[PDB]
Design a protein around this ligand. Structure first.
Ligand SMILES: COP(=O)(O)OP(=O)(O)OC[C@H]1O[C@@H](n2cnc3c(N)ncnc32)[C@H](O)[C@@H]1O
Length: 172
């Protein structure tokens, strides 16, 4: 398990790869895969839709059961559910939806949930549907997370931009 390979090491504990998070999960067999969730665990598009599709909708049914028992998550919060065929566990983390005016500072709270797990395969939280600048999401991750985070960025042009931007900011 946790057989990560081909990552670029950004810091002592943050790694990045140009890869689809679902294909990485199948390759790596991680203990924890992170979902970029919303408070009602309605896994539609982006990472949540991709993860859910790869579980043949089991992650959505499990999430429906969770919500019916526990109610919606809070923004910046998380829950640990099954990783189904992709991982031992899925950590569902809710970044702020910047497009709806939710506090961008809650992206720090969101990434703080990573610190409860020794190693994670994760996406850039809030950087898609939720409208945060991906460069900002990466900076918050690097600054907030102390545990080992392996970031999967599927789009090559974004990957290239993130790496070059990270280098410029790291040295200045
Ligand atoms: C809930 O709204 P969020 O903004 O928190 O989350 P989301 O829309 O999923 O996007 C979060 C970031 O992961 C990127 N991304 C989308 N699909 C994949 C995938 N299969 N593998 C890897 N990365 C992906 C997306 O392009 C964005 O950079």
């Amino acid at each position: 398990v946790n057989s990560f390979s081909g990552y670029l090491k950004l810091t002592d504990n943050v790694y990045i790869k140009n890869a689809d998070i679902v294909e990485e999960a199948k390759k790596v067999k991680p203990t924890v895969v992170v979902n970029a969730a919303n408070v009602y665990l309605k896994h539609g598009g982006g990472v949540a839709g991709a993860l859910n599709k790869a579980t043949n909708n089991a992650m959505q049914v499990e999430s429906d059961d969770y919500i019916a028992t526990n109610g919606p998550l809070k923004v910046g919060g998380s829950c640990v559910l099954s990783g189904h065929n992709l991982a031992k566990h899925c950590l569902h983390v809710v970044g702020p939806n910047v497009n709806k005016g939710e506090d961008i500072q809650l992206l720090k709270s969101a990434y703080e949930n990573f610190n409860q797990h020794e190693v994670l395969l994760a996406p850039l939280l809030s950087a898609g549907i939720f409208g945060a600048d991906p460069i900002h999401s990466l900076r918050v991750c690097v600054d907030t997370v102390r545990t080992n985070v392996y970031l999967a960025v599927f789009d090559k042009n974004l990957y290239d931009k993130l790496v070059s931007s990270f280098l410029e900011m790291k040295s200045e």
